[PDB]
Amino acid sequence: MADIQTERAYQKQPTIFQNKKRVLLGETGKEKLPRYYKNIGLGFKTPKEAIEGTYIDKKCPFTGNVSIRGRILSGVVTKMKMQRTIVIRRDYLHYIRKYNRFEKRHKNMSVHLSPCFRDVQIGDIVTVGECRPLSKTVRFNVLKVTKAAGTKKQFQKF
Amino acid sequence: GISRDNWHKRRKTGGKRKPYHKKRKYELGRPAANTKIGPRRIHTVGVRGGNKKYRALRLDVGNFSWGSECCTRKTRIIDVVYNASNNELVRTKTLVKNCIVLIDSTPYRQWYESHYALPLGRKKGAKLTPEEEEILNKKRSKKIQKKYDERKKNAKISSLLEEQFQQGKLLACIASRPGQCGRADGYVLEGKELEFYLRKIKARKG
Amino acid sequence: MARGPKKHLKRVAAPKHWMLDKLTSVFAPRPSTGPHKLRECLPLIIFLRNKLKYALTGDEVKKICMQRFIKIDGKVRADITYPAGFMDVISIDKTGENFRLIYDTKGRFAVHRITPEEAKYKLCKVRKIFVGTKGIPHLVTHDARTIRYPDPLIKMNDTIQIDLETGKITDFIKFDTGNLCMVTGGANLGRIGVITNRERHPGSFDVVHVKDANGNSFATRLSNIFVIGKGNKPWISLPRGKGIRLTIAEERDKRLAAKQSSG
Amino acid sequence: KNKEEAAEYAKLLAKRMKEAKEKRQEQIAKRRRLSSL
RNA sequence: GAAACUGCGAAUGGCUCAUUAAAUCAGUUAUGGUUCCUUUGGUCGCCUACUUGGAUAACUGUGGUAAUUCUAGAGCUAAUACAUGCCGACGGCGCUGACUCCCUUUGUGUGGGAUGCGUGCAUUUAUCAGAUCAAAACCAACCCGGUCAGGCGGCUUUGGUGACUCUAGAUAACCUCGGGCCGAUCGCAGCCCUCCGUGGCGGCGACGACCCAUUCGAACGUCUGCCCUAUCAACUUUCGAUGGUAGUCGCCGUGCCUACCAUGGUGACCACGGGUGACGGGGAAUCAGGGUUCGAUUCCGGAGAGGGAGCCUGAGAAACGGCUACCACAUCCAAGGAAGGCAGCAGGCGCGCAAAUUACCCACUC
RNA sequence: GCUGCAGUUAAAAAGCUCGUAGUUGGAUCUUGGAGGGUGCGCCGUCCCCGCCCUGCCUCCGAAGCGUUUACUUUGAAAAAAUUAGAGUGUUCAAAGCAGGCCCGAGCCGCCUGGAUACCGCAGCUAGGAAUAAUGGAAUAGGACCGCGGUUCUAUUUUGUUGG
């Protein structure tokens, strides 16, 4: 959790209003914050964390004001140095006829990562989706965390 | 002049982008209104695609709405108290979106007393006897007491807002973009936001 | 370039299906702004002097038009480069001819005379269906005609019989498995046929498996499919050929057999 | 003219209910049969 | 009907390839991130109304300047230029209401009112709305329908897209104001009046406007593909380098910019740096097959008009057959001044291995 | 010199080994009978196909929906010019996109045209399931209202509305 609100500006979802009010129990009222969410589409389940969560993230595909349209890509997570954003490495095959073997090649792609996803840990394969320019670098948003404790080289548990 | 284009600076690779074409009007951009509080002045600006955008420089009244009330009143904007972006904005008393201002309350008070007939805070007897009392006294027998009776329950109003009423100045957050729109509008703070700003207002103050 | 709208067309960079020659000049007509997209249109000038042979010059095409001789969908059009298109009518009166612009199996606007009725109505494919201003709803057809208050069944991709004097939809056809179809673009441009299947993709791109009256099957993008009535029952004239499509060998077999003997 | 179109359109949508309304009924009644068991 | 004013074009075309090496660009995608003239489709009732104010050109006349696409001064004076502002009306409907009846002291329940006084859209803000599902026992209130012996039951509603804070509706205002909109045109030629002079009506033929969509587009965003080089191996930020967060700015996305706050982002899968007989592609040439090389150049996309930078207008231009400064060049002069940009068509100099008429026409193609 | 080079002595295997990147990687997990194309004079010859001597589940469609891919296969999307390449009497041809007829003109006229193909990749579709990788349960886990105690949330419905 950690107090979100943290900054100096009051974090809130736009046009989702309040009004607490008098009388007893709650008190005001118990949830104290109406929350608005939506499913991205493309059959990406909007994870519970999004609905359950307090966090604000405009950039979030479920909780925020961003639409996912365009290319849907998958990549492996190389970095999770930056707050709320990750870098994924995309391997692809380059074909060279002139004589014919193509050589592995890669590209790194910066992509925003909603706090709804966690355990975003380097090594994880992830499915990101195209989006409106979030930041000068970031074109994408993490839609699904593919996972696996597998890759055994260790034993994951639950 | 000013040039939204990235095509200066450096990419992510870090390589020196080489100059392609000049600075192009399509990329065009501008100086800020830096709108300031006081007797109204506005200027028209030519924007892309025809279309005219108001640049407000100096504003004294805005249209601020009391959300929980569901009512909006036009008041003088007294001053700038808090600004997340930059402090100068506050000290200079410059108007921008997200700026936290103090409006004036009197229009809100006049409406509230009239509609609920319970007067805010615990002001005074002499005041009641004077004007606003006349409204309170009202009557029609009849006319209005029945309405006042119907109301009650809400009418609690929230401690933080009422306390502010005593001052005669209410905290509000500028919703609109004065430099763009030419209107300095906003909503009275409240609930949680009001709690956060009060914490900021006292905390930093001293 | 780079400050404004192009006003010229280098001929050669014009759409093939007008079948303008290579020599002649540098520039093709270039369709005015109008009810049909520039690629997908047939500037009257090409119709009057390139298909119908009424005109020789472009100077003549103009002289014809200023008479008022020619109406498109009923309402005299006086521009040389007016962008007429699919489902348009075109009526030259003091000559008594009604023509409907609808495709070859080549994919070429065909010279297709229609009766003095029929000329009354055209079939438009719904492009969007809209709640406009004040709460009114509207449909938008391919040919850029907006009709308010349509009946609530009508949904994007359905087609719609427009009156024509009056505007006014005077019924409709749903897009459902088994409807007759006209192909309005792409490799299969001009083929007519029933349906069979719409394969659906979220994100983007829906394909329509079509089967012709010869059990010939093919796909195109949903964008390219136009509904024109009920199997064996088109709601308009079809051009000779019933948009069939025949192999270059079949095509040769017909060409030599029908003549140098066979009347 | 616009008023006539709006009024006529409402009739078709409102009148359609009669024929469509029956459709729903063929569900409510059955909703009891399945629950029976 | 010379002209002038007005409106529109002049942002297109034509020309060259210098700059420029993931830049440009090609194929693919996209705008749910936005602007869009025009066409096309829609949208237009609330006591000067039978219609408001007053001035500039063309013109006349008088001139100035060595020389000017210079222009003064004055006297007029046109408008679909300019600044205004209305007949139109129509209301029941909202809040207020002299009040009054019935079943019950006070009250409580059920009721209904003569007369007063925000309502067209646009924009901005705030709020609501934008309805998804199956059954029962009791208590407090009260609607109808069939009733006698307090006693039996029961119903009505919300547009679309895979996903929007989408469209649309309701409430409170706001003004972006004089500075949103709702319109202050022509030339040629028989009607009728619950009734008498009026007001209502009739032929031929001569652009604006608000808002929405459309069309031609535009501006950005996706990937995937580029020459040589390591005698270029670490690079990028205190003059933002990568990210958070909020604002200002822009047509709009975005470190665009700025504050604060993090310390990032990239590299042997060649980054960074440098070079270049590099504009990029469709294409071209050489033909076993594989390949090998070129592409400035009749099309597409991009770029520039002596070099650099800035700007006005307008929907669209960072325009040079616009302007403006400097910088480099050149020209006229009565020496104070003043006027200019052939990588447009011809032509000419210089350059070189190398490249045409100082010609005719808008008839074709547009 | 991919296809398709040479390196003992001709120009050319580092003095030798370790070694990261890169490249490269063992075996092993499903087993005649007729339909349609073109030759030869009612007969047959020679391909191609489902067969004989293999998506689950949800509970025909729909939907659930994919273990990841690469690959390959079938579609769409794929500028014109160009190029390969059909139809076409520029007299021939390069070209060009025409033309050829009915007709002796009273025909107050007919009509065929101006194909198609290629189009890298990447992306989009789709079928295959070999090949190459890839998925887990052995410090036990997944399945099936197998069953329960604990707690939460959403709206049908006791006419209506509140507890």
Swiss-Prot record, chain A:
Phosphoserine found at: 67, 110
From its record, what is one biological process in GO terms?
A: translation
Q: GO molecular function: any one?
A: rRNA binding
Q: How is it modified after translation?
A: Citrullinated by PADI4.
Q: Where is the lipid attached (S-palmitoyl cysteine)?
A: 60
- N6-acetyllysine modification, residue list: 38, 45, 58
Instruction: PTM Omega-N-methylarginine: list the residues.
Output: 69
InterPro entries in the record:
NA-bd_OB-fold, Ribosomal_uS17, Ribosomal_uS17_arc/euk, Ribosomal_uS17_CS, Ribosomal_uS17_N
Give the matching Gene3D superfamilies: 2.40.50.1000
Annotated localization? Cytoplasm; Nucleus, Nucleolus
Regions that span the bilayer = none
Q: Which residues form a coiled coil?
A: none
Q: What is its main location?
A: cytoplasm
Citrulline modifications at = 22
Location of N-acetylalanine modifications = 2
GO CC terms of this entry = cytosolic ribosome; cytosolic small ribosomal subunit; nucleolus
Keyword annotations of the record: Acetylation, Citrullination, Cytoplasm, Lipoprotein, Methylation, Nucleus, Palmitate, Phosphoprotein, Ribonucleoprotein, Ribosomal protein, RNA-binding, rRNA-binding
Family membership: Belongs to the universal ribosomal protein uS17 family.
Summarize the subunit comment: Component of the small ribosomal subunit. Part of the small subunit (SSU) processome, composed of more than 70 proteins and the RNA chaperone small nucleolar RNA (snoRNA) U3.
- Output this protein's name: Small ribosomal subunit protein uS17
Lineage start: Eukaryota, Metazoa, Chordata, Craniata, Vertebrata
Curated annotation (Swiss-Prot), chain B:
Q: What GO CC terms are in its UniProt record?
A: cytosolic ribosome; membrane; nucleolus; ribonucleoprotein complex
Q: Where is this cross-link: Glycyl lysine isopeptide (Lys-Gly) (interchain with G-Cter in SUMO2)?
A: 169, 192
Q: Where is the lipid attached (N-myristoyl glycine)?
A: 1
Q: Which GO terms describe its molecular function?
A: structural constituent of ribosome
The record's subcellular locations are: Cytoplasm; Membrane; Nucleus, Nucleolus
Which residues, renumbered to this chain, carry the PTM N6-acetyllysine?
36, 127
Basic residues compositional bias: what residue ranges?
7-25
Residue ranges of the region described as Disordered? 1-26
User: Which InterPro entries does this UniProt record tie to the protein?
Assistant: Ribosomal_eS8, Ribosomal_eS8_CS, Ribosomal_protein_eS8_euk, Ribosomal_Se8/biogenesis_NSA2
Q: What keywords sit in the KW lines?
A: Acetylation, Cytoplasm, Isopeptide bond, Lipoprotein, Membrane, Myristate, Nucleus, Phosphoprotein, Ribonucleoprotein, Ribosomal protein, Ubl conjugation
PANTHER family documented for this protein = 40S RIBOSOMAL PROTEIN S8
By its UniProt entry, which NCBIfam families does this protein fall under?
eS8
* Entry's family note: Belongs to the eukaryotic ribosomal protein eS8 family.
**What is this protein's function per UniProt?**
Component of the small ribosomal subunit. The ribosome is a large ribonucleoprotein complex responsible for the synthesis of proteins in the cell. Part of the small subunit (SSU) processome, first precursor of the small eukaryotic ribosomal subunit. During the assembly of the SSU processome in the nucleolus, many ribosome biogenesis factors, an RNA chaperone and ribosomal proteins associate with the nascent pre-rRNA and work in concert to generate RNA folding, modifications, rearrangements and cleavage as well as targeted degradation of pre-ribosomal RNA by the RNA exosome.
Query: What is the protein's name according to its record?
Result: Small ribosomal subunit protein eS8
Query: What gene does this protein come from?
Result: RPS8
Curated annotation (Swiss-Prot), chain C:
Domain of life where this protein originates: Eukaryota
Q: Which Gene3D superfamilies match?
A: 2.30.30.30, 2.40.50.740, RNA-binding S4 domain
Instruction: Name where it's found.
Output: Cytoplasm; Nucleus, Nucleolus
Q: Where are the transmembrane segments?
A: none
Q: Which GO terms describe its molecular function?
A: rRNA binding; structural constituent of ribosome
Q: Answer yes or no on keyword Glycosyltransferase.
A: no
User: What are the record keywords, sorted?
Assistant: Acetylation, Cytoplasm, Isopeptide bond, Nucleus, Ribonucleoprotein, Ribosomal protein, RNA-binding, rRNA-binding, Ubl conjugation
Cross-link entry Glycyl lysine isopeptide (Lys-Gly) (interchain with G-Cter in SUMO2), positions = 230
InterPro entries membership: KOW, Rib_uL2_dom2, Ribosomal_eS4, Ribosomal_eS4_C, Ribosomal_eS4_central_region, Ribosomal_eS4_central_sf, Ribosomal_eS4_KOW, Ribosomal_eS4_N
Q: Which residues form the signal peptide?
A: none
Q: Which family does it belong to?
A: Belongs to the eukaryotic ribosomal protein eS4 family.
Q: How does it assemble?
A: Component of the small ribosomal subunit. Part of the small subunit (SSU) processome, composed of more than 70 proteins and the RNA chaperone small nucleolar RNA (snoRNA) U3. Identified in a IGF2BP1-dependent mRNP granule complex containing untranslated mRNAs.
Full protein name: Small ribosomal subunit protein eS4
- Organism this protein belongs to: Oryctolagus cuniculus (Rabbit)
Curated annotation (Swiss-Prot), chain D:
Q: Which residues carry this modification: Phosphoserine?
A: 35-36
Location of the protein in the cell: Cytoplasm; Nucleus, Nucleolus
Sites of N6-acetyllysine modification:
11
Query: Could you describe the post-translational modifications of this protein?
Result: Ribosomal protein S6 is the major substrate of protein kinases in eukaryote ribosomes. The phosphorylation is stimulated by growth factors, tumor promoting agents, and mitogens. It is dephosphorylated at growth arrest. Phosphorylated at Ser-35 and Ser-36 by RPS6KA1 and RPS6KA3; phosphorylation at these sites facilitates the assembly of the pre-initiation complex.
Q: Where is the composition biased (Basic and acidic residues)?
A: 17-29
Q: What does this protein do?
A: Component of the 40S small ribosomal subunit. Plays an important role in controlling cell growth and proliferation through the selective translation of particular classes of mRNA. Part of the small subunit (SSU) processome, first precursor of the small eukaryotic ribosomal subunit.
State the oligomer form and interacting partners: Component of the small ribosomal subunit. Part of the small subunit (SSU) processome, composed of more than 70 proteins and the RNA chaperone small nucleolar RNA (snoRNA) U3.
Task: Return the protein name.
Answer: Small ribosomal subunit protein eS6
* UniProt organism field: Oryctolagus cuniculus
Give the fragment's position in the full-length protein.
201 to 237 of 249
